[PDB]
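Lab notebook, page 48
Experiment: co-folding of the full assembly
Goal: obtain a model of how the components sit together before planning crosslinking
Operator: M.T.
Materials (sequences as entered):
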Amino acid sequence: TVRKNQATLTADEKRRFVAAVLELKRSGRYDEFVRTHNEFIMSDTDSGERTGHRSPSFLPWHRRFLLDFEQALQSVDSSVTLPYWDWSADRTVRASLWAPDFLGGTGRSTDGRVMDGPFAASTGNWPINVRVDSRTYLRRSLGGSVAELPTRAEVESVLAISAYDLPPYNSASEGFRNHLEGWRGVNLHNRVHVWVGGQMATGVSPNDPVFWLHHAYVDKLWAEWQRRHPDSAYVPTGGTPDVVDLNETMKPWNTVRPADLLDHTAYYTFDALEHHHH
Amino acid sequence: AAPESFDEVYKGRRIQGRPAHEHGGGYEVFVDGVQLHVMRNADGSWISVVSHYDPVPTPRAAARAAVDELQGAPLLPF
Ligand SMILES: [Cu+2]
Ligand SMILES: [Cu+2]
Ligand SMILES: [Cu+2]
Ligand SMILES: [Cu+2]
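Observation: model returned without errors.
Model output:
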C-alpha cells in the first residue's frame, strides 16, 4: 500500500477512491467511523482519560483509525489507498482537491451547502446522518473562519521540535505532538479543521471525506518527524494515569499499543518521504 | 471555581449557561433549551461540539459561536 499526494492521483484513482467512499456510506459502514470519532472527541479531556486527541496517543490512535478506514475501503476496491493532502502546498480553494471530480468545492454563502462534487447533498449519495443539528447536507466554508492554511515554514518549525510530547501530556503541553495537533504554537492540525469549516470544524468532522486526507498528511508529518529525530520516540513509557503509555493498549480496539504503530512501513509507505540527513 | 451562569438572547436565540458517550462536564450550555456539549481546556478556554477546534475564552463565547455556526438550525441532543 502506497499513500500518495492527492494532487498526483490519476483520473482513474480519483474515480475509484470516490466510488469506494460512497459504497462505505451506502452500506452504513461509513457513519460508524464518524460515530466512533465523535465519541472520543467528546470524551477526551485535559484532566481525565484522553486517548484520541489532546494527548500523546493522538498520533498512533489516528494512525490505527485511518488504517481501519483504509482497510474498509480496500474491502470494496482493493486498489484504493488513502491519499494525503499537503495543505502547506495545496493551500487555495482552487486546488484540484476541491474540484468536482474529487471532493467538490466550498459551500454556498447562504447555508454553507456544498453544491458540486460527488458528496453534494443534491446527488442523494451523501446524507449527513451522524450530526449535532438538524442539517443533513455537507457544508464547507473554505478559508472562512481563518485566513490561511499553515505554510511550509511553519510546518518546518514544528518538525524541528525534538521532544515527542511532554507532561502534562495534554492541550497545554510543549513538544511535537501538541504543536502538530495545534493547541499551542503556530497551529497545524486544528487550524486546518477550522479552515475547511462546515462539519470539518465540528465534533463530527469525518462527515467530510477530506478528514481522511487531512489526517493522512498529519500522519505523514509524524513519519517525517521520526526521520528528523531518530533519537526521539513516543512518550510516556509507563505508569501514567489517564494517558496511553507506549506499551499500553488503546480503546476502542483494545488489542494494539502505540508501540505497534510507530513504524508505518509495516502497513504502508509514502510516494515520497525524505531520508534522515544533516 | 466554575464560570458564572448566563442567560441572553443572541441572534434571536436563547443561550443559557450554568455550573453543574461524552465527558463529565462542570458546566452546561443550552441553545433554545437544547443542551450544547461544551468542554474546558487546560488554559481556561472553551470549545463545543459544533466548534471543537477553535478555542474561545468563555462558555458564553462558545454558545455564541455555536449560534453563529448553526445558522438558524435546531440543535440535536447529544
Ligand atoms: Cu480527531
Ligand atoms: Cu483532526
Ligand atoms: Cu543523524
Ligand atoms: Cu461531556
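Interpretation: The first helix of chain B runs from residue 59 to 70.
Next step: discuss with group before ordering constructs.
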